[PDB]
Structure 1
Amino acid sequence: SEKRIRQTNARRLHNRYYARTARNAVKAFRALTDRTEAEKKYPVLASMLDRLAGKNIIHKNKAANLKSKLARRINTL
């Protein structure tokens, strides 16, 4: 019975770390102004979101929504 508790707790910490990292990266990217700098840091954050969706921490549709929003912003500066 403790095996389920331990596995659930370890997985909860593991998921929380990566989800929080991705959320902070998205929040930091949303505040950028320089178009060249935003275009330079967009690929790494897109990679982070797609890797999260692959690891199943978030949904592929959620990653797609976030990437679409950030690409639209980078288009409009």
Structure 2
Amino acid sequence: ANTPSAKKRAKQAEKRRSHNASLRSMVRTYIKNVVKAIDAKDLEKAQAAFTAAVPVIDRMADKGIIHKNKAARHKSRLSGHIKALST
């Protein structure tokens, strides 16, 4: 960089990336738990994982880590998969 503004922006951007990566991995792991539970044909596990995973998905969409459309899509598809599994 050549000016102080660029250096400060680079420093702040590195901090932002460090903060955001952990939360994104959090959301991914919470979704993957539900996906694995569904793939194993386990109902009670599926409801437990879905109930644990919906609040974090909504909270992280609200914080701005992901877009709310993605949260709605994930919720809809997980709900459909679980409801189809129950029958």
Normalized against structure 1, the TM-score is what? 0.90
Match of 1:52 in 2: 60
% same residue: 36
Which runs of structure 2 are paired with 1:1-77 in the superposition (5 Å)?
Answer: 1-32=6-37, 33-77=41-85
Aligned length: 77
Structure 2 gap ranges (5+): 1-5
Structure ID, larger Rg: 2
State the distance in 2 between where 1:62 and 1:34 align.
25
Residue 61 of structure 1: CA displacement?
A: 0.4
**TM-score, L = length of structure 2:** 0.81
Query: Does 1 or 2 have the higher relative contact order (CA < 8 Å, sep 6+)?
Result: 1
Superposition CA RMSD, Å: 1.1
Tell me how far apart the structure 2 counterparts of residues 14 and 73 of structure 1 sit (CA, whole Å): 32
After TM superposition, the runs of 4+ consecutive aligned structure 1 residues lying more than 3 A away are none
